[PDB]
Amino acid sequence: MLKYIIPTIMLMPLTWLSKNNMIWVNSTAHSLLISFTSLLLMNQFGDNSLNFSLLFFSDSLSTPLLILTMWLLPLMLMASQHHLSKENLTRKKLFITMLISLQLFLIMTFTAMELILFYILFEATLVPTLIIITRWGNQTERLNAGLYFLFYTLAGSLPLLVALIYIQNTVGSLNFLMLQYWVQPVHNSWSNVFMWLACMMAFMVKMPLYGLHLWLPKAHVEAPIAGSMVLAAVLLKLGGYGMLRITLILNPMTDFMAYPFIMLSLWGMIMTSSICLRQTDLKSLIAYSSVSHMALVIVAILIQTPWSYMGATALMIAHGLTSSMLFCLANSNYERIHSRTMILARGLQTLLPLMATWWLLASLTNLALPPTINLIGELFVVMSTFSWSNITIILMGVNMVITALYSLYMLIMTQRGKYTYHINNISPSFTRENALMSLHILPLLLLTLNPKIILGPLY
Amino acid sequence: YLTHQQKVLRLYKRALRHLESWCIHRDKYRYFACLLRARFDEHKNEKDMVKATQLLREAEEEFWHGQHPQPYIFPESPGGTSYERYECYKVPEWCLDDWHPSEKAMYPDYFAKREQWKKLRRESWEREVKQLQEETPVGGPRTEALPPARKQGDLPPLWWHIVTRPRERPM
């Protein structure tokens, strides 16, 4: 992974040594090349994963998340240009440095072969994420949003460290390849019940799980656009990726310890989907939409079936592109009216005809229109949960109805109707904004032609 | 509110249109339109405001019990099949300021006239502010009606959007 780690590190000298006016052109141009070389990770075999060294490896689960992670950095650079226009030059360079270091930790997190190396890098992503929100956010609530984001994660991560170090002492290793062969069944004792909780609650808070989600509406709303894109697209998937790994050493206790968490997710879908129907903030509506889609991922990882894991992997990639696009769309309007209220600007389809086409496509993928990969991942999870219990079709079905309602509610509220009279500064969409939306939707739709590269190890 | 004269006038118009819906055929409507007029003609004037209200309240109750469930609606009125059918084609005029010069050059005449209106609108704004803060009580205006221009060469206050509003069938 040194072919990806080192060039990412070299983006830091590049930004600081570049001409004052060319910081956005070099970082965007060279970070796009790093994304291009990430396609070499697709040398995946049917039996063995691609093991590089003692420290890093890449199977079909890490690869799509790595390619996604390295693809967002150039996009986040474009979205940040407008609101950093009047920013001091040195502070602006410090912003691009935080985003580079966040990618550096992410690409090492998804590829780490040893579970304590994963923990250190998994926990290291908070510092660059916390700094972006608290320093380059707009509202007063960013400070309180930063504290909520920090202490929800640590409250779960710290027990995870005690469990991970305990597992090494008992098993003698935390290397993931070793665990696939030295894993032992987990007996049903009160001591193991709390080992199970410690190995999962850290990942549950990051998904997030319903009930433990009262930082996503704060962090995903008070953060800058670049923070919202990475918070929603790749940072929520660390919990999903972590569970898809650590459930290997929790069988068979996952059979009964999953019940309270399947219920929170199954009933958390309806609760969060319903919340979106009454939100008075376009950015908060998109944020709650993430808790509903990640609720399907928790259920998919907790039932442990080949179809559920294939559905979970596809859902995480599909959500990342869609949610990142929805935040970008909400930000383009905010950059004009400078307010997050959803009812303030209406009928924008009359003033921004093309930007309203991006709204439609983002909404269609959000409500999982086939054959988009959003539907493929979601469909494979309904098929698997149906076999887990035929009654889950009721809760899956109701959410699909509510998902279509709030997706099209924001499309109708902000694109259709009648334009607000006293809004007279709706300038035409810049080429930067249109290119930003294309770079999400086009790869999302192209994955429909060859979807096996995002279906994970169990394909 | 709406006085007492206006309520009966409004009720009379509704009653005929609801009656027009039941009758459909014009000959029947004329036969019953005058009959319903007579029932209003019986109790014209009649003073006795206290008894006047009783006749109207009874009238409203009768109208409600006998109103058509699906009254005819004009196609372009609230409830009609063509109400707001062209709101999507109505683009404001401030968007033209955002046009690219390469596409303004397609209409050299039209934007020449716009500069006159924009030039006219800027020069007249100051007088319109004066015209409004002089013809208004100390405790702010108490009605939504606006005064005209008390001079020659002065445009009425608050005319830009009233005059320049989008056409009814812009495309």
């Binding site: - | 404001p92 033209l96 690219h100 209409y107 812009p170």
Partner: peptide
């Protein structure tokens, strides 16, 4: 009698 149809800027 062709009239001017006001549209948002279609150049960008």
């Amino acid at each position: 009698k062709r009239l001017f149809i006001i549209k948002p800027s279609g150049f960008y």
